[PDB]
């Protein structure tokens, strides 16, 4: 059995409901079917567990962007990235919300992950996208700002779901709304970067 | 209005630091240079004050969208809206962050503002943008999703500033970065909606 995974999943739900400071390791333990000491065998502190949870989300989010290669068809790759990001917003919204919460507080526990591994990845893949700009496979846009727009637009549907629901009546659990959302976000970003 | 303003601004800072539940009216009062009973002449409860803080940022955010009229040149109006939203992200980031925080928690106190006045505005201005779609002044996009993209892409630079800074080295207080940000967000969205 996958007790580490059960703890991570329980932690996500607890952290998302109570925040870092309000959350007690006893709450997570009980939710995951383990004792507090058992939990401490996998994660030596609440801090370590929290960082582990946010690393899970990062890996899920960044998987498609890691996969980008020079020889990929740029528009198709970016279309697919948008779709996959929206699937994450549909399937792991509480994680998206927790990551956002950490940013709102100034990234006190996650800053190192952003300045190190994230920055290095985005430099690498920005150069790759810049190469597509120079080839004329994309219109002249800044790679970093393109990336941020993908992140912001796709994560909005989870992080701002109450507002989305108030305005539209819907959520990403509605299959028709999910599809419309994918089509429109793709339409705007893709037509914005298509070479003319 | 100088005391009402001082209370609102003190409230923003206190709420941001301590959260809704941890904040006491006596903390805000002292930070604003007024007595608790003077504060209560302006705002009869902590809840009412919290909602007012978030109403300040709504009004600021929504001013350009309120101004939209049928006869406006659609691309120029949307370009300008994007710029103005980024100015707000530069100038009132802590308010953007508090509004985001309220959404992340499910909008427990702000829901009425969203279902009433906001929804009514967005319906009105979505119909107005739909009219521009039907005229051929914009490419066929969904108005609501366009609006959400403007919101998400512009608010990202405040709400996710630590990440933006980790990746780029910059903030919206850097004049060159601010200018690049405006240009690229406009480039992507405007080219995405330009009629072909
Ligand atoms: O996909 C991602 C990468 C990490 N940060 C972000 O906001 N979205
Ligand atoms: O621009 C806006 C106003 C409405 N709410 C929001 O998230 N941003």
Swiss-Prot record, chains A, B:
UniProt GO BP = negative regulation of DNA-templated transcription; positive regulation of DNA-templated transcription; regulation of DNA-templated transcription
Q: Annotated DNA-binding ranges? A: 23-42
Q: What keywords are assigned to this protein?
A: DNA-binding, Repressor, Transcription, Transcription regulation
Which Pfam families does the record match to this protein? TetR_C_3, TetR_N
Q: Name one GO molecular function term.
A: transcription cis-regulatory region binding
Superkingdom of origin: Bacteria
Q: Which SUPFAM superfamilies match?
A: Homeodomain-like (SSF46689), Tetracyclin repressor-like, C-terminal domain (SSF48498)
Q: Which PROSITE patterns match?
A: HTH_TETR_2 (PS50977)
Asked if the record carries the keyword Nucleotide-binding, the reply is no
Tell me where in this chain the HTH tetR-type domain is found.
1-61
Q: What else is known?
A: The Rut pathway degrades exogenous pyrimidines as the sole nitrogen source at room temperature but not at 37 degrees Celsius, a restriction that is apparently a consequence of an inadequate ability to remove toxic malonic semialdehyde at the higher temperature (RutE/YdfG function).
Q: How does it assemble?
A: Homodimer.
The record ties this protein, via PANTHER family, to:
HTH-TYPE TRANSCRIPTIONAL REGULATOR RUTR (PTHR30055:SF196)
Q: What does this protein do?
A: Master transcription regulator which represses the degradation of pyrimidines (rutABCDEFG) and purines (gcl operon) for maintenance of metabolic balance between pyrimidines and purines. It also regulates the synthesis of pyrimidine nucleotides and arginine from glutamine (carAB) and the supply of glutamate (gadABWX).
Q: What is the protein name given in its UniProt record? A: HTH-type transcriptional regulator RutR
Originating species: Escherichia coli (strain K12)
In the UniProt record, what gene is named as encoding this protein?
rutR
């Amino acid at each position: 059995s996958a007790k580490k995974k059960a703890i991570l999943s329980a932690a996500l739900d607890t952290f998302s409901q109570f925040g870092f400071h309000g959350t007690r390791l006893e709450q997570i333990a009980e939710l995951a079917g383990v004792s507090k000491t058992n939990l401490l065998y996998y994660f030596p502190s609440k801090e370590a567990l929290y960082i582990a949870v946010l690393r899970q989300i990062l890996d899920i989010w960044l998987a498609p962007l890691k996969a980008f290669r020079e020889d990929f068809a740029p528009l198709a790759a970016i279309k697919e990235y948008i779709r996959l990001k929206l699937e994450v917003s549909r399937d792991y919204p509480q994680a998206s919300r927790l990551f956002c919460m950490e940013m709102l507080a100034g990234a006190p526990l996650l800053m190192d992950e952003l300045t190190g591994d994230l920055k290095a990845l985005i430099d690498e893949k920005s150069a790759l996208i810049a190469g597509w700009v120079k080839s004329g496979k994309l219109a002249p846009i800044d790679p970093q700002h393109l990336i941020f727009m993908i992140w912001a637009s796709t994560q909005h549907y989870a992080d701002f779901a109450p507002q989305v629901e108030a305005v539209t009546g819907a959520t990403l659990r509605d299959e028709v709304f999910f599809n419309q959302t994918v089509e429109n976000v793709q339409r705007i970003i893709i037509e914005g970067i298509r070479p003319r």
